[PDB]
Assembly symmetry: D2
Homo-oligomer: 249 residues x 4
């Protein structure tokens, strides 16, 4: 019987690449999405045509609120309903936008940036563990946490809290045989609204190849961490940044 994985924000980009690669490893996947309904349905269709009844979709908003604990519990329950088990959780969904210290209200920004990056992963970790072999959780972090982008405090705080969770959950869930790890990209798939000249500026900063990581290169590290080649690894953050975090100003 095939193991099952939950991947958050899996409709497109890096989340999709992780969902695809986990499926290619033989996982049945729950494809979580928020707004991207068509891309999520289309991804599940491509994976179900490869192997029938191996991909389902699951809609949930991961913004912080008093109903968020129930939304996260349902995401996890949707895996057990469709596949009868949950072996892997991948915390990939993330809001990303500036919040300068000097549109959306601040309480909305806080709820989205901390909710998606830290609080939902915490509640998803709770539910994953409480619903319970090679069990593992993989958190999508940020290799640039110590060298943050200007005016991204709430986003930076969220990813720092995610490092804390990864270490805290690794310690506490180790007796239960659940490994908690992280993957930290530098520059991978750049924002869609980012101009090409701004893209190349960041590409030129990368020592290894002067380019960004492909989504597949991120998914490769996720797949290593969930495999039997990493059975002793827990509380480890693997940066996949091509040397970006090593370059001085």
């Amino acid at each position: 019987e095939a193991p099952a994985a939950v991947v958050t924000g899996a409709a497109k980009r890096i989340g999709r690449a992780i969902a695809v690669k986990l499926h290619q490893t033989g996982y049945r996947v729950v494809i979580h999405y928020h707004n991207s309904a068509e891309a999520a349905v289309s991804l599940a269709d491509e994976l179900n045509k490869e192997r029938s009844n191996t991909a389902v979709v699951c809609q949930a908003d991961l913004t912080n609120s008093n109903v968020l604990p129930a939304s996260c519990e349902e995401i996890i329950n949707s895996c057990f309903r469709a596949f009868g088990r949950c072996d892997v959780l991948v915390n990939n969904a993330s809001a990303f936008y500036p919040t300068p210290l000097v549109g959306k209200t601040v309480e909305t920004q806080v709820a989205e940036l901390i909710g998606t990056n830290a609080i939902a992963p915490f509640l998803l970790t709770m539910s994953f563990a409480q619903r319970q072999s090679n069990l593992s959780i993989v958190n999508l972090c940020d290799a640039m946490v110590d060298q943050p982008c200007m005016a991204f405090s709430l986003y930076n705080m969220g990813k720092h809290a995610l490092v804390g969770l990864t270490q805290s959950a690794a310690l506490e869930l180790a007796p239960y045989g659940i490994r908690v790890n992280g993957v930290a990209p530098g520059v991978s798939l750049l924002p869609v609204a980012m101009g090409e000249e701004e893209k190349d500026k960041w590409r030129r900063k990368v020592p290894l190849g002067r380019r960004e990581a492909s989504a597949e290169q991120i998914a490769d590290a996720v797949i290593f961490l969930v495999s039997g080649s990493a059975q002793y690894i827990t509380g480890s953050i693997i940066k996949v940044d091509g040397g970006l975090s090593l370059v001085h100003a």
Copy 2:
């Protein structure tokens, strides 16, 4: 005239010591409190006896909610109202208790632990910078990489505080605002904790097999706000007696 300082959770323990020591150095102080009104007033009385009209109190819940941004804005305004200036912000207030992954609802635990430790300091930082030797000092934790068992949300809150310290230091540097952290290991142990558990933590400490007094924590805060630290920003000073260096 004299510089003014905002200290959150300043009625007792580490906050009180920071407030006293800032006052002794010549600062006028806002003593923020949530539940400890009497203690806050009695501290203010003691400081006002020393120098008239140099200490005020301020009440605010720092739990995460829809009204939190306004509460943080009024704490900062309270400093400008009393003293006409705000030079130092000390983010000391902090909820601390366990949250097992496997009583208070989880949404309330999130609101208090992430609220007091990370979100309130974020909102106070915003208000501090917006209203302008200016410095902010965040009360971190030296055991962030070696967390207490079942203290996930608290650990998440303190990790986020490190992130705020670094981000704020970067963004506020052009404005002349320095942002630093002080990370206690074991200082004044929780009032609830038992003597047995207290002495266990004390023997772990390489330096003197004792805990830090609150004023040893305050000494590091006093250094960071002074002219001796004019070039220091984005730094976190451990005050743990070597505790974080000890293996399992």
Copy 3:
């Protein structure tokens, strides 16, 4: 065409497991040794039984001295003489004994601990890169920030090795050479160590309450040299089962 790998201290324990797994993956291997001649030769015969002329041995002392650069140049050259190429360098050889701050002379301790853990890896890296999916893997230590009592020089050697990993990754990236690290917590425990002391360390480990097999360490090395890690440089992968996260 089959790639080639140099593994230092490959006669026994972790280095042997790394040598075996690299060979099983399709690498031709230089098995470096210092004193363990019989074990190194025994491994080479084992591997050459599997595939003919795919393993050679290389004797060198990796203590710091004026002949160390020449020795490291010869180790790298032996891989080219045997196999016509050098694709992978694994710095595994390591001296490990206490050096109290308050037998060997101190200058021998400095030469041995800093030589094997830091200086030889630097000199091997120089010779590796100068001779050119190229990668280097350095054997670090997950407990580098929570060090064993009275192991100063060893801790210094391992800290310096983290420095080399980061510096070489930055500098050799234009050449397409990746430089990474594997950091074990508790793996294969010392040979003469009593099971009672062994169990004290095993009990410290959150994951499974046991030490890492040499094969589990080798697994992270195999991943870092593979095509699944072609964007990974300057990274240090902990294989410690959550040990570095446990407070005193």
Copy 4:
């Protein structure tokens, strides 16, 4: 009885400013130098003029060799000889030059960069503690240690090893009442050999003030760590870099 301090590389720049401030704090100082004989003697004069019998000089090469343990033993002995006590050790002396992986022999480069930045500090710490209130050691580290200069491997390795010494010695010497800390400058007094356009390039990188640290601002952090306001601080490294280490590439 006024306390006594050893400052290595104390004839010029940061080391000199540390020696001066310590003297102003009431310490009697040993001025260690290697080649700056005129500057060291001149400094001892100035300090002895202000307060008689408070300053001596001590010449020593801190390059790694078999005689280095003896040289370090002698530097400490020189403090006990002049002042009858030794309360503070400041490890400031340091060689700083590129060692690309692809003018001196490599063996000489290894000996100077690892010797001065790591090994001599280790042997001085050993000799200091062997001869033993508020006793403390301050190691001059580097804020840019995880974001190193290109082609500075051996220097960077030496500074990394110095962080490890600071933490190891703090742990080990704690039962003896000896605190061991570090100060990590980012951009401070820029090297003499550097061009003025390079200097401005580095100055522009600094978030706080767009300038470098004066030697005195570095000395202020050293003075704090040796004082009674830091008697619970051990194994801590204080960055004095004006936020430089927080700036991404």
